[PDB]
Design a protein around this motif. Structure first.
Motif, PDB file in Angstrom:
ATOM      1  N   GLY A 166      -2.498   6.484   3.798  1.00 53.45           N
ATOM      2  CA  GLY A 166      -3.569   5.638   3.259  1.00 53.45           C
ATOM      3  C   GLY A 166      -3.072   4.650   2.216  1.00 53.45           C
ATOM      4  N   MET A 167      -1.817   4.806   1.794  1.00 57.51           N
ATOM      5  CA  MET A 167      -1.209   3.940   0.802  1.00 57.51           C
ATOM      6  C   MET A 167      -0.536   2.870   1.628  1.00 57.51           C
ATOM      7  SD  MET A 167      -0.029   7.145  -1.517  1.00 57.51           S
ATOM      8  CE  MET A 167       0.212   8.043   0.013  1.00 57.51           C
ATOM      9  N   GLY A 168      -1.396   1.951   2.061  1.00 62.90           N
ATOM     10  CA  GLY A 168      -1.233   1.157   3.263  1.00 62.90           C
ATOM     11  C   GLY A 168      -2.013   1.818   4.395  1.00 62.90           C
ATOM     12  N   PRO A 169      -3.376   1.774   4.359  1.00 57.98           N
ATOM     13  CA  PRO A 169      -4.179   2.378   5.450  1.00 57.98           C
ATOM     14  C   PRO A 169      -3.972   1.717   6.819  1.00 57.98           C
ATOM     15  CG  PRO A 169      -5.589   1.596   3.635  1.00 57.98           C
ATOM     16  CD  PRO A 169      -4.231   1.010   3.432  1.00 57.98           C
ATOM     17  N   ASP A 210      -4.010   2.952  -7.492  1.00 57.57           N
ATOM     18  CA  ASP A 210      -3.069   1.885  -7.120  1.00 57.57           C
ATOM     19  C   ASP A 210      -1.664   2.243  -7.590  1.00 57.57           C
ATOM     20  OD1 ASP A 210      -2.042  -0.521  -6.063  1.00 57.57           O
ATOM     21  OD2 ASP A 210      -2.614  -1.695  -7.818  1.00 57.57           O
ATOM     22  N   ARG A 211      -0.692   2.171  -6.680  1.00 57.40           N
ATOM     23  CA  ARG A 211       0.644   2.749  -6.902  1.00 57.40           C
ATOM     24  C   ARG A 211       1.450   1.906  -7.891  1.00 57.40           C
ATOM     25  NH1 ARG A 211      -2.922   3.247  -2.822  1.00 57.40           N
ATOM     26  NH2 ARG A 211      -1.860   1.462  -1.845  1.00 57.40           N
ATOM     27  N   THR A 212       1.550   0.607  -7.601  1.00 56.48           N
ATOM     28  CA  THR A 212       2.162  -0.391  -8.502  1.00 56.48           C
ATOM     29  C   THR A 212       1.313  -0.593  -9.791  1.00 56.48           C
ATOM     30  OG1 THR A 212       3.412  -1.535  -6.721  1.00 56.48           O
ATOM     31  CG2 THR A 212       2.897  -2.859  -8.672  1.00 56.48           C
ATOM     32  N   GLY A 213       0.001  -0.354  -9.698  1.00 61.11           N
ATOM     33  CA  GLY A 213      -0.924  -0.430 -10.840  1.00 61.11           C
ATOM     34  C   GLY A 213      -1.112   0.851 -11.649  1.00 61.11           C
ATOM     35  N   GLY A 219       3.577   8.371   3.314  1.00 54.18           N
ATOM     36  CA  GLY A 219       3.600   7.025   3.894  1.00 54.18           C
ATOM     37  C   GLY A 219       3.628   5.899   2.883  1.00 54.18           C
ATOM     38  N   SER A 220       4.451   6.071   1.852  1.00 53.54           N
ATOM     39  CA  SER A 220       4.650   5.092   0.788  1.00 53.54           C
ATOM     40  C   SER A 220       5.983   5.448   0.134  1.00 53.54           C
ATOM     41  CB  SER A 220       3.498   5.148  -0.234  1.00 53.54           C
ATOM     42  OG  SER A 220       3.759   4.390  -1.414  1.00 53.54           O
ATOM     43  N   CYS A 221       6.898   4.489   0.087  1.00 51.24           N
ATOM     44  CA  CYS A 221       8.131   4.656  -0.663  1.00 51.24           C
ATOM     45  C   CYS A 221       7.864   4.809  -2.163  1.00 51.24           C
ATOM     46  CB  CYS A 221       9.078   3.499  -0.389  1.00 51.24           C
ATOM     47  SG  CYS A 221       9.622   3.450   1.336  1.00 51.24           S
ATOM     48  N   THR A 222       7.310   3.811  -2.803  1.00 52.39           N
ATOM     49  CA  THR A 222       7.024   3.972  -4.193  1.00 52.39           C
ATOM     50  C   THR A 222       6.568   5.387  -4.447  1.00 52.39           C
ATOM     51  OG1 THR A 222       6.149   1.749  -4.107  1.00 52.39           O
ATOM     52  CG2 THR A 222       5.759   3.014  -6.039  1.00 52.39           C
ATOM     53  N   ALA A 223       5.474   5.754  -3.824  1.00 52.56           N
ATOM     54  CA  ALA A 223       4.850   7.080  -4.021  1.00 52.56           C
ATOM     55  C   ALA A 223       5.805   8.267  -4.223  1.00 52.56           C
ATOM     56  CB  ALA A 223       3.904   7.390  -2.868  1.00 52.56           C
ATOM     57  N   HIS A 224       7.039   8.156  -3.736  1.00 58.47           N
ATOM     58  CA  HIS A 224       8.058   9.187  -3.966  1.00 58.47           C
ATOM     59  C   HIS A 224       8.435   9.367  -5.457  1.00 58.47           C
ATOM     60  CE1 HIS A 224       8.333   8.846   0.405  1.00 58.47           C
ATOM     61  NE2 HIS A 224       9.033   9.965   0.415  1.00 58.47           N
ATOM     62  N   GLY A 258       6.840  -3.523  -8.129  1.00 58.77           N
ATOM     63  CA  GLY A 258       6.546  -2.149  -8.552  1.00 58.77           C
ATOM     64  C   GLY A 258       7.397  -1.084  -7.885  1.00 58.77           C
ATOM     65  N   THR A 259       7.690  -1.286  -6.602  1.00 63.05           N
ATOM     66  CA  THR A 259       8.616  -0.422  -5.862  1.00 63.05           C
ATOM     67  C   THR A 259      10.012  -0.454  -6.512  1.00 63.05           C
ATOM     68  OG1 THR A 259       7.398  -1.092  -3.838  1.00 63.05           O
ATOM     69  CG2 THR A 259       9.387   0.243  -3.536  1.00 63.05           C
ATOM     70  N   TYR A 260      10.453  -1.664  -6.879  1.00 65.00           N
ATOM     71  CA  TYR A 260      11.723  -1.890  -7.595  1.00 65.00           C
ATOM     72  C   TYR A 260      11.766  -1.301  -8.995  1.00 65.00           C
ATOM     73  CZ  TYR A 260      14.378  -4.924  -4.477  1.00 65.00           C
ATOM     74  OH  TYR A 260      15.133  -5.421  -3.447  1.00 65.00           O
ATOM     75  N   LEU A 267      -0.039  -8.538   4.908  1.00 60.41           N
ATOM     76  CA  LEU A 267       0.221  -7.321   5.677  1.00 60.41           C
ATOM     77  C   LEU A 267      -0.864  -6.257   5.493  1.00 60.41           C
ATOM     78  CD1 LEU A 267       4.104  -6.785   5.249  1.00 60.41           C
ATOM     79  CD2 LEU A 267       2.961  -7.883   7.170  1.00 60.41           C
ATOM     80  N   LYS A 268      -1.140  -5.908   4.235  1.00 57.36           N
ATOM     81  CA  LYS A 268      -2.196  -4.936   3.885  1.00 57.36           C
ATOM     82  C   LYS A 268      -3.599  -5.327   4.357  1.00 57.36           C
ATOM     83  CE  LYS A 268      -0.292  -2.364  -0.061  1.00 57.36           C
ATOM     84  NZ  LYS A 268      -0.544  -0.990   0.455  1.00 57.36           N
ATOM     85  N   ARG A 269      -3.875  -6.634   4.434  1.00 58.64           N
ATOM     86  CA  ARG A 269      -5.169  -7.136   4.919  1.00 58.64           C
ATOM     87  C   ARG A 269      -5.265  -7.172   6.445  1.00 58.64           C
ATOM     88  NH1 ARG A 269      -6.105  -8.871  -0.319  1.00 58.64           N
ATOM     89  NH2 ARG A 269      -8.379  -8.663  -0.128  1.00 58.64           N
ATOM     90  N   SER A 272      12.785  -1.692   5.068  1.00 60.51           N
ATOM     91  CA  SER A 272      11.395  -1.794   4.732  1.00 60.51           C
ATOM     92  C   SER A 272      11.183  -0.919   3.538  1.00 60.51           C
ATOM     93  CB  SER A 272      10.449  -1.382   5.860  1.00 60.51           C
ATOM     94  OG  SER A 272      11.105  -0.935   7.020  1.00 60.51           O
ATOM     95  N   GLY A 273      11.583  -1.400   2.370  1.00 61.20           N
ATOM     96  CA  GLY A 273      11.399  -0.666   1.134  1.00 61.20           C
ATOM     97  C   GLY A 273       9.937  -0.343   0.999  1.00 61.20           C
ATOM     98  N   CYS A 274       9.109  -1.355   1.184  1.00 65.88           N
ATOM     99  CA  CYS A 274       7.671  -1.211   1.165  1.00 65.88           C
ATOM    100  C   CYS A 274       7.348  -0.868   2.574  1.00 65.88           C
ATOM    101  CB  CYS A 274       7.017  -2.534   0.880  1.00 65.88           C
ATOM    102  SG  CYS A 274       6.346  -2.652  -0.767  1.00 65.88           S
ATOM    103  N   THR A 275       6.589   0.178   2.776  1.00 68.04           N
ATOM    104  CA  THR A 275       6.318   0.597   4.146  1.00 68.04           C
ATOM    105  C   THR A 275       5.604  -0.405   5.042  1.00 68.04           C
ATOM    106  OG1 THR A 275       4.642   2.023   3.129  1.00 68.04           O
ATOM    107  CG2 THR A 275       6.526   3.034   4.073  1.00 68.04           C
ATOM    108  N   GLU A 276       4.876  -1.322   4.466  1.00 62.54           N
ATOM    109  CA  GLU A 276       4.149  -2.275   5.257  1.00 62.54           C
ATOM    110  C   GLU A 276       5.022  -2.949   6.279  1.00 62.54           C
ATOM    111  OE1 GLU A 276       2.471  -1.465   2.475  1.00 62.54           O
ATOM    112  OE2 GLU A 276       0.788  -1.128   3.815  1.00 62.54           O
ATOM    113  N   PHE A 277       6.289  -3.094   5.979  1.00 63.35           N
ATOM    114  CA  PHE A 277       7.196  -3.736   6.936  1.00 63.35           C
ATOM    115  C   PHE A 277       7.439  -2.907   8.192  1.00 63.35           C
ATOM    116  CE2 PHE A 277       8.296  -5.540   2.817  1.00 63.35           C
ATOM    117  CZ  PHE A 277       8.206  -6.900   3.094  1.00 63.35           C
TER     118      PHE A 277
END
Ligand SMILES: *[C][C@](*)(C(*)([O])=O)C(*)(*)(*)([N])C(*)(*)([O])=O
Ligand SMILES: *[C][C@](*)(C(*)([O])=O)C(*)(*)(*)([N])C(*)(*)([O])=O
Lengths: 227, 227
Positions: free
Chosen positions: A9-12, A48-51, A82-87, A126-128, A162-164, A189-194
């Motif tokens: 869902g972090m990228g639904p 929000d992960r970056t937020g 299903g989110s890199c940051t989220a790790h 934020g991932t960075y 991508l998210k939209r 694809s650091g950010c999973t959206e890719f």
């Protein structure tokens, strides 16, 4: 018998498309019974992960993960977030909940080791900030970090396009540009959206680029990876 | 806060595509946090639905559902089963587990009442054997039942084409043919796989046909239906 749990869902949009990949890359021969057994926790309401990093309550976010891992540990054999940051929250979780885990960073790390050429880490600011790849990967010297400027242009792509749920190919021209700039023919694809892009490229048969997409890599090797 | 549970995999391709619809038809304005919270139990290993009726062990199948409903009753607020046939086991389940349920037959029934023209029930021979629509719908006199012959031709489409993840538009010509034969410009996705078709028609902007697709109807009215 073997079951994968996906805290997503972090990228639904990605979450949905990822599941679609699992069945695309594991099409049954005779009976559907054959096919992959997946559980998907699709929760966009995840803070929000970056937020969550840029406010006081990362405390709220870590709880979210822990709660859902406690659940998934019972119902699944293997678990994927299903989110890199989220790790970034995994230091804070007790080790028993992470026994079943499959790190998107580790998958990216193995893939990059085999490919073994410099490869551009496509990720949001934020991932960075969390430095998940620079600390997590053994193949870190092969990772080309984006400039802070370009991290924000990728933040645009991820969130605005991508998210939209818009066509991932629209950003392709801007991605080809970056690839020439940082001087590779490959990306992570650091950010999973890719995941969404990775597919759209494979669909078009555009083989000029080598994509290190963990979600693709999981989907394809489901039969092997899940015990 | 509000959460939908989906017992699916009975059509794993559809299951994936259904989730994709949920986010397609509920695209956020500003934040992803807005978007639908879904849990998906995608289990292809569910004993063959049309083949559980033609052997001794429907006993095995009913258990499968009950077990997974017991789980989902805790984690979800509303529950949907991603297979029409599969509803045939609901007589055998204790009423407390079905408190949260949303019958695909009931959704189809309401839709048909509003549309209020004769409409072709597109379903496999096994879906028909269970007589779920003829018993379940109030609008049953408006349902045109296929001939046994054509039920098997639809069995072909579902299993040989749709379930195998091939382009749903390939069958379109054969479906237009049936629609003229039985003399309507409308269909009911008795078999859920026709979610895949319903989309592909909407994508092409082919408005000549009126599709009564419960999974579309759920996805679109998620904001309303889920409490
Ligand atoms: C931070 C982004 C997200 O999905 O929340 C990115 N997709 C990631 O986590 O890799
Ligand atoms: C029987 C079929 C299935 O998916 O198992 C059909 N899609 C249905 O149940 O409606």
């Amino acid at each position: 018998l073997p079951i994968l749990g996906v805290l997503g869902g972090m990228g639904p949009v990605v979450t949905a498309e990822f599941l679609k990949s699992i069945y695309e890359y594991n099409p049954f021969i005779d009976k559907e019974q054959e096919s992959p057994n997946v559980i998907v926790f699709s929760f966009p309401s995840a803070p929000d992960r970056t937020g969550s990093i840029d406010s006081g309550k990362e405390r709220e976010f870590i709880d979210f993960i822990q709660v859902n891992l406690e659940h998934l540990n019972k119902l699944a054999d293997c678990i994927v977030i299903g989110s890199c940051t989220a790790h970034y929250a995994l230091p804070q979780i007790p080790e028993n909940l992470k026994d079943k885990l499959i790190s998107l960073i580790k998958i990216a790390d193995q893939e990059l080791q085999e490919y073994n050429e410099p490869t551009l880490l496509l990720a949001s600011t934020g991932t960075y900030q969390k430095k998940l790849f620079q600390e997590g990967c053994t193949t870190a010297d092969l990772i080309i970090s984006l400039s802070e400027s370009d991290q924000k242009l990728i933040h645009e792509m991820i969130y605005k396009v991508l998210k939209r749920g818009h066509d991932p190919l629209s950003i392709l021209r801007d991605i080809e540009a970056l690839l020439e700039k940082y001087n590779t023919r490959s990306y992570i694809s650091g950010c999973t959206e890719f995941h969404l892009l990775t597919k759209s490229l494979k669909l078009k048969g555009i083989d000029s680029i080598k994509a290190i997409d963990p979600l693709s890599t999981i989907a394809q090797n489901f039969s092997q990876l899940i015990i």
